[PDB]
Amino acid sequence: QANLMRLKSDLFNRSPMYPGPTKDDPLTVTLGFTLQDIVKVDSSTNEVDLVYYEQQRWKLNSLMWDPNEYGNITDFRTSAADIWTPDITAYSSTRPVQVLSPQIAVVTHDGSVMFIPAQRLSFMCDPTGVDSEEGVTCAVKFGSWVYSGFEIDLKTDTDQVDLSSYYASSKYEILSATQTRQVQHYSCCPEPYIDVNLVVKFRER
Amino acid sequence: QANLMRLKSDLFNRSPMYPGPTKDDPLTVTLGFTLQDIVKVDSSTNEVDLVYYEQQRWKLNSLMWDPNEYGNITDFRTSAADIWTPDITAYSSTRPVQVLSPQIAVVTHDGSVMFIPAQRLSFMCDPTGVDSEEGVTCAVKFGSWVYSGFEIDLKTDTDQVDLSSYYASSKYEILSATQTRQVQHYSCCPEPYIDVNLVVKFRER
């Protein structure tokens, strides 16, 4: 439409692309997971696959506008390729992550960007104990590939992994599923480091 | 082709890209399937693979023209990447969907776009009972990835999955194949949500 087509144009084709966070201007990023299923286990290789949705939230001053100057538009969706996006990455993966959906975000007049692609991840996990009462735990830290806590502030809004889409006929049952954020201070180093630790305790149904 | 090239030149190359639908300017997208075969059933992982043609239809003012100004040309074929196409996707895929054909659309002088590519889709399904005489039911729902019922109005013309092309020597027998639209009203949320639920009930032939 008229104004949206104008809005997007002013936000994207006018200014240079956000160059990323810095210690003088730390960016807060909120992360959460919606676990759909544990689609694979492999005891011959100690590999585990998940299928879940991954949301990430951040706010950028450069993506701000006056709605009144743009036909009262409060927000819009756009290709995630049109914006800057974080490097929140799994740290102990065994394969290249697969995207199971489009990558489209939502920018809000105040600057909020939200983004939730579907993913399949293969990570390191010895699953011996899966076929049993007590089950087995699998942990996989998530954090930024290259920013310390001084530049990107990784936060979760709840320590609890969303299991409301966890498959009814999945071969496994979630004994527990947490997304706890830890902030590490290393005696070696002045800057802090943040990871969000995905811990999933589960067994064969 | 001088007439045709000039037309395409005027539509695509001269007017900003359709920025997608809004609450202010909604869009009806019609979706339907043609199931060819159920190609993989995996009891150990719980995934099913289907090959089918996926049909998508919508109309845009941005894409209408007067045949008289373009030598009576009423409709043309151009590749889907030349146009805006919706984000209708399977909310439960376990692998990136695989395109099995060229993606080319037919644009009409009235703004009607149609697009029917073939696809291999792996999704979540517990197939216990496929050997049985009663079969097994697998379900996957399709919907916009980023749009609500207020921006994308998703429908079907028939609740029947078209089985006129089903592979005659399939290892499987289709007991029923439906593509039913569902409108969701959540207690939490003002805006409605629409999925087109693809349900196939089948057994070994």
């Binding site: - | 919907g143 980023v146 939490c188």
Partner: peptide
Amino acid sequence: GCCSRPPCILNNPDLC
């Protein structure tokens, strides 16, 4: 549920 679908999660981040 709302939180079981992508477009609803985009519209209701905290509300999920």
